[PDB]
UniProtKB/Swiss-Prot annotation, chain A:
Gene name of the record: malE
Listed name of the protein: Maltose/maltodextrin-binding periplasmic protein
UniProt family annotation: Belongs to the bacterial solute-binding protein 1 family.
Main location per the UniProt record: periplasm
Function: Part of the ABC transporter complex MalEFGK involved in maltose/maltodextrin import. Binds maltose and higher maltodextrins.
Key words, A-Z: Periplasm, Signal, Sugar transport, Transport
Subcellular location: Periplasm
Phylogenetic lineage: Bacteria, Pseudomonadati, Pseudomonadota, Gammaproteobacteria, Enterobacterales
Any Gene Ontology CC annotation: outer membrane-bounded periplasmic space
Source organism (scientific name): Escherichia coli O157:H7
One of the Pfam families matching this protein, by short name: SBP_bac_1
GO biological process, one term: maltodextrin transmembrane transport
Length: 452, 454
């Protein structure tokens, strides 16, 4: 369905409750006369920035919040302006997840974290540690079963283990993420991925295992454990499996640290239906009845709507989800997240398959994930090199009142100035400040060029 | 102007034994008629690269080896080619310090490491730790003395403490330094500099203390300790102080880690007197008699000449020098060293004065020391960006076949390619190789424009 004024087209991932969302859409149409079409395209999170400005994109896009900063930086998302009463209906930390450079860029829907899911009839007492899993697998293999199967093709699922002993994405410090400081090839990351690779070398897991292979094995009663999120509980409910949901195993005595996602709904900046989309999202979806319809299809996790979460929170599966969430980290929403995930996806797949050592794979991922800093630095310095000597002086002065000590800047050339801007404010803010200051020193040419 | 033919002009720092060196020069003149002039200009390590780039300067320059890789890269130093029997006379690790890009670029003279020097009458037992020094100062202050004074204006002297708990210049791995990995603002570096600044805040040291102030205070018996190298011992000999030379204090249980220098003699690439210089250095200076003449003026430290060092090593001051040298690290000689030193110099001065916090000062130093990599990267990426798709492919093909894995290069964009090249070759060679290849793939315009870059 193409976008047209007077209707809504919604994209949501295929593992979520899209049939439930379509029920909310049908209720909306009943009550307003306005048609809603829910779709679940493959790779929608890659497709959206390719087609967002066209009629072949959606009016509303659902994804975890980590992708949204990149979308907003590219001008793809409308600013969200909820009134006071509506904002108070949702938990503050969920609004935080969708805040980007001081603006709300989506509606938060639900908090997602991975848990350990286990078959109580194969495994009444699940392991508290990763280290126990080889022994468990050995005994289960004797019965033609296995201990653990989960998706090894997406780094989301392996990240909790990589992070446990000290791996991280971007270091948080000074009120921001430092995109130069990447933690994917430190000792902790290496330790975690080496444990994963050792499980595969010792035939306790298969490098080819993906989402569908793991889901089928668990729901058929072939493997004792899997790792997945709340959306997966619906198919297990349907299965004959008596299952539990519990804290992830520790590694080297430390909790597994899943990256926590907030399912979020953004409004296409190019949509002729922005007000229509706001009405649907605020007054039909983010209601008790709306979220229940989606949740009944596939569980959302811990929803952002206080009134409905007070019910869901009593569910032990939700308590476990929140326990794992608290041990993990909220994902950044910065634009560099896409490149981080691609880099780590390649590292895990290459290490797991044996095509690269863990050391080589993570070293390459480190370099790939950090290239965004180098690119930002070189671009900013190249613009600053255009300034005349007197214009650079004025540039440094105005950086005080825009909001770095003058003594730190006085001697600095264009490259050092780019370094200072990015290290102090981060890449996006450094760029915004630079271009803004350009039009303050009569270099609107640079401002114009920088816009393009 | 060209350097004058038929004599030798030598530059050496004023804190070294230049009068003793002039005595060796006179011995040379007695045998050969060749006049040797020894000078000690201020800031000679900064003046030499300016003067030598234009083909002027001294015939021979003495400095620690860390400055020499930069000089060599700029074409300022002649390759040294001593015969095997001569090379055999000096310790292998001193030759290592003066090797750059596979070639020897200077003669090593002596190993220099900082030690703790103490007044045995004020302080019969020197402190094991840095941590105990504030209490020591409090006690001495009640006797009209102080515990410790040393030069706070040059980072050489403060580096041993900054490095003790984990600070480092450039990361060393696989016989190669990584210039994008700078260790001047990690936890260890911050802890060390914070201790120094707290010494000053609590009035156990003065941020304004420099070399001459510290030397006077120690040599007049006003402070119980100083930190200095072997060149300082002669002046202390002439004072009334009964002194010892010992291991530096530890910090958080870790030894202080001085950056170790090898005093080295380089031959100016522009000199018409290279044979004279070789003859002087090999057959007059680097002999027992030659080094003794210099050493008796101002001590050299642990000399590179095996035969003379076997005598000096019996001196407990030399044993202590070598103990501190072992706990420290030989300085890199890569061109980026001078930028590192300038960066840390500013950081220590600003933190000590209270102009910046330790965290702000070391953050700036980190940025400044890291800029050499970034500058090379941004320039090389800009030039590779100018290549058409088919030219970039050709650029890669020549680099992959020439008499770096293809898998690393094949799908790399200009910025990634610039990264690969600088990492694999170093910034200087990466750039020269790039320009050379531009010429090879019908982009002589980039070669031409590139040659005119700074
Ligand atoms: O694997 C990288 C991937 O991780 C996250 O995607 C999750 C998503 O958040 C979940 O709701 C569910 O759909 O599983 C996905 C993993 O397959 C990030 O949100 C995503 O951007 C990233 O590519
Ligand atoms: O302070 C930085 C400075 O340290 C070293 O200089 C030493 C030199 O090696 C010693 O022989 C003696 O003269 O003291 C100097 C410090 O004042 C490095 O060799 C030099 O490059 C660097 O700038
Ligand atoms: Na069931
Ligand atoms: Na990605
Ligand atoms: Na004396
Ligand atoms: Na004496
Ligand atoms: Na003397
Ligand atoms: Na050592
Ligand atoms: Na310097």
């Amino acid at each position: 369905m193409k976008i047209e004024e007077g209707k809504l087209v919604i994209w949501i991932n295929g593992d979520k409750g899209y049939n439930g969302l379509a029920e909310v859409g049908k209720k909306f149409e009943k009550d307003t006369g306005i048609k809603v079409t829910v779709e679940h395209p493959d790779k929608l999170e890659e497709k959206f920035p390719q087609v967002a400005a066209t009629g072949d994109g959606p009016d509303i896009i659902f994804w975890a919040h980590d992708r949204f900063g990149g979308y907003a930086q590219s001008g793809l998302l409308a600013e969200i302006t909820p009134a006071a009463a509506f904002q108070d209906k949702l938990y503050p930390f969920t609004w935080d997840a969708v805040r980007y450079n001081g603006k709300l860029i989506a509606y938060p829907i639900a908090v997602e974290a991975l848990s350990l899911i286990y078959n109580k009839d194969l495994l009444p007492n699940p392991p508290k540690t990763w280290e126990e899993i080889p022994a468990l697998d050995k005994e289960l293999k004797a019965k033609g079963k296995s201990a653990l199967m989960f998706n090894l093709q997406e780094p989301y699922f392996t990240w909790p283990l990589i992070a446990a002993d000290g791996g991280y994405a971007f270091k948080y410090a000074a009120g921001k993420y430092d995109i130069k400081d990447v933690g994917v090839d430190n000792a902790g990351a290496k330790a975690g991925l080496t444990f994963l690779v050792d499980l595969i070398k010792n035939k306790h897991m298969n490098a080819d295992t993906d989402y569908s292979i793991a889901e089928a094995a668990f729901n058929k009663g072939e493997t004792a454990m899997t790792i997945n999120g709340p959306w997966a509980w619906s198919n297990i409910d349907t299965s004959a499996v008596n299952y539990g949901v519990t804290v992830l195993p520790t590694f080297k005595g430390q909790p597994s640290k899943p990256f926590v996602g907030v399912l979020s709904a953004g409004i296409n900046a190019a949509s002729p239906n922005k007000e229509l989309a706001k009405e649907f999202l605020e007054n039909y979806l983010l209601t008790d009845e709306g979220l229940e319809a989606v949740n009944k299809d596939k569980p959302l996790g811990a929803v952002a709507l206080k009134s409905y979460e007070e019910e869901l929170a009593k569910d032990p599966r939700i308590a476990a989800t929140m326990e794992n969430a608290q041990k993990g980290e909220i994902m950044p929403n910065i634009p560099q997240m896409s490149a981080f995930w691609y880099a780590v996806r390649t590292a895990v797949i290459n290490a797991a398959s044996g095509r690269q050592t863990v050391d080589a794979a993570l070293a390459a991922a480190q370099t790939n994930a950090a290239r965004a800093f180098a690119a930002a630095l070189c671009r900013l310095s190249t613009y600053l090199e255009e300034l005349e000597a007197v214009e650079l002086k004025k540039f440094k002065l105005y950086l005080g009142t825009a909001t770095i000590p003058w003594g730190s800047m006085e001697k600095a050339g264009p490259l050092e100035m780019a370094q200072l801007l990015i290290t102090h404010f981060g890449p996006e803010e450094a760029w915004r400040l630079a271009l803004s200051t350009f039009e303050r020193i009569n270099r609107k040419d640079l401002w114009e060029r920088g816009q393009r």
